[PDB]
Amino acid sequence: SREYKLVMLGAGGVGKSAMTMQFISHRFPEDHDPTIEDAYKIRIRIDDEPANLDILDTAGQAEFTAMRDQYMRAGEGFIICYSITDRRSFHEVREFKQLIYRVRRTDDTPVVLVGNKSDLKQLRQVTKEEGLALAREFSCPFFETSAAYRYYIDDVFHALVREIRRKEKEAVLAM
Amino acid sequence: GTVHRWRRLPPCDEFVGARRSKHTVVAYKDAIYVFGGDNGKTMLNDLLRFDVKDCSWCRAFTTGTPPAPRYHHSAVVYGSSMFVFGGYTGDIYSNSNLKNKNDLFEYKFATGQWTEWKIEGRLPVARSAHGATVYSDKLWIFAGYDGNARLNDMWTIGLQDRELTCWEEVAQSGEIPPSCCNFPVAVCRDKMFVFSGQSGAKITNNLFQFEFKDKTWTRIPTEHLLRGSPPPPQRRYGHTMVAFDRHLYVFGGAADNTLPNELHCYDVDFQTWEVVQPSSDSELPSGRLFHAAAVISDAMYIFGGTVDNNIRSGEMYRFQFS
Ligand SMILES: Nc1nc2c(ncn2[C@@H]2O[C@H](COP(=O)(O)OP(=O)(O)O)[C@@H](O)[C@H]2O)c(=O)[nH]1
Ligand SMILES: [Mg+2]
């Protein structure tokens, strides 16, 4: 069946693992080892159509493992994540978007931009409007999510699959 | 020369071969042979020869169709031949035609002949970053990444007569290591050893032995805490491991977003780890990953690997065994 391989991109500590777990098992991780990178699966029905998702929670900065290398090259969609309480992570967003170009040799690869930890309204260092501006600059959907309370978690991955199915169908029309 | 001396040998010239990572090195006679890898721009399928006694590089003479350019493949030596299996193939520059492989190529050192062993019947799944070794006249393939998930199956194939050989999947027993990739394999006595490696959520610094005769895996426990023995090396991937005398030597790799350069030694007979202290006049190598190692007589040889910041290396380091 249709297997969608997605990649969780983002600086260390933005909450990539917390967002993944919530999406695949409706749980918040207690003490998650940040140096752990693995892939996780789930079958959800977006727009009344079942879809198999294979999501890689990335970690580490050395040369990619064989799993990561093939994921960055064959993955159909990317989720670039930052923390709204971490302006440094909000700046690395562009470096990840550049990284996608270096591998894919194109900027049309489906992407969704996510600013995590929206519940931390007290320590907010990145405004919501900025994330929208960066998303329109990237021509990609934008969500402010909270992995702690599962706010808009499903909407992020739902959107990316829509981007994939949209871009796949636009190719068929040309051919 | 000196015992435990990290000697820095002349690196590979650019007009001979590009500095690369994720390649394979194999020892034959008294020469190191380098095949495949990644220079940072494209995949490679050339063959280099480094005469150990002469300390000179050279592009090896190859006739016939070589394997498609690849990295994360395996390479072993059986008799007077090098056997390449698996790996990733494609076009990095355009991110196209990318696919894993399960083919088997033989390089006759004597004549420089590249021959493909077109094996009939059921094949192992095309994979990369797998472990490989030669024992009892058979090539052993283990684990790796097939393109959808990490693996932990094991396959063998006889290397005596290509006309009559075929692939056989191993019914493994014991504590099979979890699905792993980018791990080293070193055979010692009648047992195969695997240490650490990228296994996803189950990444550990565990040591596994595989007894070929009963096809059983055993995770060697460490009592270092109780007997005040040196702890095992930090968990890592993309590292090498060779066997000399009754000892395993682990070096390199990426350990939790770091590239340590310590030389770790495992006493298989006394189930203890060590950190070998190099000599005073040692030319210590830098922390690298996705390099490759080989042993000629009483010496270990390291070549290539990503040193840092995605810089590919072409340095030849030599460690003298006690
Ligand atoms: N309050 C809150 N904390 C979060 C959220 N996401 C992550 N965290 C915390 O931030 C830390 C880093 O999370 P982690 O998923 O390991 O970051 P990663 O390295 O990108 O995977 C953890 O201690 C989490 O408890 C969130 O949405 N809300
Ligand atoms: Mg994480």
Side-chain angles (χ1 to χ4, degrees), chain A residues 1-101 103-168 170-175, chain B residues 1-226 228-322:
Chain A
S1 176
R2 270 302 304 174
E3 180 160 3
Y4 296 88
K5 281 192 175 62
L6 319 173
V7 178
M8 292 291 286
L9 288 170
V14 298
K16 304 187 284 300
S17 297
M19 304 183 37
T20 57
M21 196 180 188
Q22 285 288 355
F23 181 59
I24 63 139
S25 40
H26 291 240
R27 278 176 157 271
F28 188 76
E30 177 188 17
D31 188 9
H32 186 277
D33 188 10
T35 73
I36 294 292
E37 161 195 307
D38 207 343
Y40 304 98
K41 314 233 201 305
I42 191 167
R43 179 165 180 101
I44 56 165
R45 203 151 79 106
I46 311 125
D47 298 326
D48 301 299
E49 182 190 331
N52 278 349
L53 281 46
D54 206 341
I55 301 160
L56 173 73
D57 169 53
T58 57
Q61 57 192 37
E63 200 168 9
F64 297 156
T65 85
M67 183 177 27
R68 177 97 88 96
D69 187 54
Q70 296 200 25
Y71 257 95
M72 306 278 325
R73 297 180 181 282
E76 292 119 317
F78 289 88
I79 310 98
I80 295 146
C81 318
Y82 68 95
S83 158
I84 70 155
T85 85
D86 185 3
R87 178 146 281 270
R88 288 77 40 89
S89 66
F90 178 64
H91 287 323
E92 304 202 34
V93 178
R94 315 182 154 268
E95 292 174 43
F96 291 115
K97 188 51 171 157
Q98 191 55 41
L99 184 50
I100 301 183
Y101 187 94
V103 167
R104 304 306 279 258
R105 310 306 308 184
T106 175
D107 272 328
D108 305 16
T109 23
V111 167
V112 173
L113 178 54
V114 180
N116 196 241
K117 306 179 160 164
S118 64
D119 55 315
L120 276 296
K121 41 179 178 174
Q122 46 277 46
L123 316 173
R124 179 185 216 93
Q125 282 163 39
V126 180
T127 83
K128 183 162 190 168
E129 198 61 51
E130 286 177 297
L132 268 171
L134 194 39
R136 305 211 187 87
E137 200 184 315
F138 287 173
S139 307
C140 78
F142 172 71
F143 300 86
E144 290 216 314
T145 76
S146 184
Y149 303 108
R150 205 178 198 287
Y151 290 131
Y152 297 104
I153 284 305
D154 291 345
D155 309 55
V156 168
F157 306 83
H158 279 205
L160 192 44
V161 186
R162 304 203 169 88
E163 301 299 298
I164 301 177
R165 301 170 159 167
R166 206 108 60 193
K167 178 177 165 297
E168 287 185 349
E170 89 189 9
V172 164
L173 299 176
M175 298 300 141
Chain B
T2 309
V3 162
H4 299 175
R5 174 126 169 270
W6 268 114
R7 231 206 195 198
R8 151 171 238 167
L9 303 186
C12 180
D13 321 306
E14 275 290 343
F15 46 84
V16 173
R19 312 171 302 194
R20 57 192 69 178
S21 67
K22 308 173 293 287
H23 54 289
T24 60
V25 310
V26 158
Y28 182 69
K29 296 279 201 65
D30 302 291
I32 297 301
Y33 285 80
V34 183
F35 176 73
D38 180 11
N39 59 8
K41 303 304 166 299
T42 191
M43 307 175 81
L44 304 172
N45 63 336
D46 52 342
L47 192 59
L48 272 43
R49 186 184 67 238
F50 176 72
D51 197 315
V52 155
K53 316 201 197 76
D54 203 28
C55 298
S56 63
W57 289 90
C58 172
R59 269 195 228 165
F61 171 65
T62 81
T63 49
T65 294
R70 51 189 65 187
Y71 60 73
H72 278 340
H73 58 298
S74 69
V76 292
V77 46
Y78 176 72
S80 299
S81 279
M82 194 183 60
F83 285 86
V84 175
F85 171 83
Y88 203 31
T89 65
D91 186 0
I92 296 180
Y93 180 63
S94 69
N95 210 62
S96 69
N97 210 33
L98 295 166
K99 56 182 160 205
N100 299 274
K101 278 289 182 206
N102 54 15
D103 47 2
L104 174 64
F105 279 66
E106 175 200 12
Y107 178 79
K108 305 251 194 175
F109 287 110
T111 69
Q113 191 68 3
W114 275 113
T115 320
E116 176 165 356
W117 284 29
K118 316 237 189 62
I119 309 302
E120 303 186 335
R122 176 159 150 263
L123 308 153
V125 186
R127 63 187 75 202
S128 312
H130 53 276
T133 193
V134 160
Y135 183 87
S136 183
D137 312 292
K138 298 180 296 183
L139 159 71
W140 306 72
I141 303 307
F142 177 52
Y145 185 68
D146 65 349
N148 297 39
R150 292 181 315 268
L151 296 178
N152 53 6
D153 57 339
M154 176 166 341
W155 297 70
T156 73
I157 177 154
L159 312 168
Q160 287 166 272
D161 197 328
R162 53 193 296 275
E163 319 280 34
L164 288 314
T165 190
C166 74
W167 280 100
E168 297 199 350
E169 178 165 8
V170 164
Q172 326 179 50
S173 39
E175 190 171 343
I176 304 179
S179 61
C180 186
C181 73
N182 293 133
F183 59 93
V185 169
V187 66
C188 175
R189 298 165 177 282
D190 43 4
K191 304 184 254 301
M192 193 202 300
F193 293 88
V194 170
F195 170 65
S196 192
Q198 164 72 0
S199 50
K202 318 297 185 190
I203 177 154
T204 56
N205 55 342
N206 274 136
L207 181 48
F208 295 87
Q209 83 173 19
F210 181 73
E211 194 145 20
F212 293 95
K213 319 316 297 166
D214 22 305
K215 294 125 172 294
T216 58
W217 281 102
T218 290
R219 171 189 77 82
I220 287 78
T222 166
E223 304 108 357
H224 68 279
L225 311 105
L226 298 319
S229 321
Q234 191 189 349
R235 62 208 205 171
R236 68 194 68 203
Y237 68 105
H239 53 298
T240 66
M241 184 173 59
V242 304
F244 187 69
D245 215 318
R246 47 184 198 84
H247 295 103
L248 313 174
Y249 294 83
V250 184
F251 175 68
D256 291 0
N257 309 32
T258 67
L259 275 64
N261 71 310
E262 313 289 353
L263 193 61
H264 304 258
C265 181
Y266 179 72
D267 206 316
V268 51
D269 283 9
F270 288 163
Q271 307 106 258
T272 192
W273 279 104
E274 195 194 344
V275 182
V276 192
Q277 287 296 334
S279 68
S280 56
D281 55 348
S282 289
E283 318 195 76
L284 287 88
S286 60
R288 64 208 46 215
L289 82 157
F290 288 161
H291 54 301
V295 160
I296 304 201
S297 69
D298 56 350
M300 188 192 54
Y301 297 78
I302 310 285
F303 176 61
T306 292
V307 164
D308 210 335
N309 324 93
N310 215 43
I311 278 78
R312 307 273 194 275
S313 162
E315 306 163 76
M316 177 63 57
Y317 285 88
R318 180 243 195 185
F319 187 85
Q320 235 288 347
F321 284 132
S322 55

